[PDB]
């Protein structure tokens, strides 16, 4: 069922990573794709989906495209009336079977919009606990208008509070050796997901993201969420 929690030298030490950590923090520091009742207008690969989506903002981008884990997930949101909620990159974002006005990518995010929010029209917050060293030093809020939410959308968010007030990611890199994030769903479902980019000297922006390609959504109101990092060398 749930998926076990690290292992102590299976999780991607900073230390390790000889680029650019700017690149990490670009992906969660105020960044992200966010749309309401759209509907997908096209595809490229068979588990992708394409939307009309306007870059409110720095005008980036009108053209959203979002791949899934799997056609049959593609097919299921395909003419769903959605809402959409990620973190999107341009290097290496392809499109055009040929030949297929800004362009932008990203993986999961999307909810349907029908019978996805609270009926007094409120906002639904979920408690974030930070870990340093084994320690709860500090826990935050964050808060979702969605019933059933992406982790994607609780994740951005949490790790956007972070680099604001711990740094989480800098320019040059991290004052944190190692960090996950995990979810614990109130029937008792527990997954992760490694915050640190992978070792080597250049970051992946697309690989990285791909983990966001299952589409999992949780219980806004019932789940909880951990993030652990240590600082455990210096
Ligand atoms: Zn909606």
């Known amino acids: 069922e749930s998926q076990p929690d690290?292992?102590?030298d299976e999780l991607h030490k900073s230390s390790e990573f000889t680029g650019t950590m700017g690149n990490m923090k670009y992906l969660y520091d105020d960044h992200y794709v966010s749309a309401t009742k759209?509907?997908?207008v096209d595809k490229f690969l068979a588990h992708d989906l394409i939307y009309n989506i306007s870059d409110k903002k720095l005008k980036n981008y009108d053209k959203v495209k979002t791949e899934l884990l799997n056609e049959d997930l593609a097919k299921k949101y395909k003419d769903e009336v959605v809402?959409?909620?990620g973190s999107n990159y341009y290097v290496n974002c392809y499109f055009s079977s040929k030949d297929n006005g800004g362009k932008t990518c990203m993986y999961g995010g999307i909810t349907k919009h029908e019978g996805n929010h609270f009926?007094?029209?409120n906002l639904q917050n979920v408690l974030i606990r930070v870990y340093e060293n084994k320690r709860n030093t500090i826990s935050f809020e964050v808060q979702t208008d969605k019933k059933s939410v992406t982790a994607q959308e609780l994740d951005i968010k949490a790790r956007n509070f972070?680099?604001?007030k711990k740094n989480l990611y800098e320019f040059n890199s991290s004052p944190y050796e190692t960090g996950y994030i995990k979810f614990i769903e109130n029937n008792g479902n527990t997954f992760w997901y490694d915050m640190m980019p992978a070792p080597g000297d250049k970051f992946d922006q697309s690989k990285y993201l791909?983990?966001?390609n299952d589409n999992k959504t949780?219980?806004?109101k019932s789940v909880k969420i951990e993030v652990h990092?240590?600082?455990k060398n210096g």
């Open 83 to 85: 809402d959409v909620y």
């Open 38 to 40: 759209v509907m997908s």
């Open 162 to 164: 972070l680099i604001n």
């Open 6 to 8: 690290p292992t102590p």
């Open 119 to 121: 009926d007094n029209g």
């Open 218 to 220: 949780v219980d806004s």
């Open 229 to 231: 990092l240590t600082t």
């Open 210 to 212: 791909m983990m966001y």
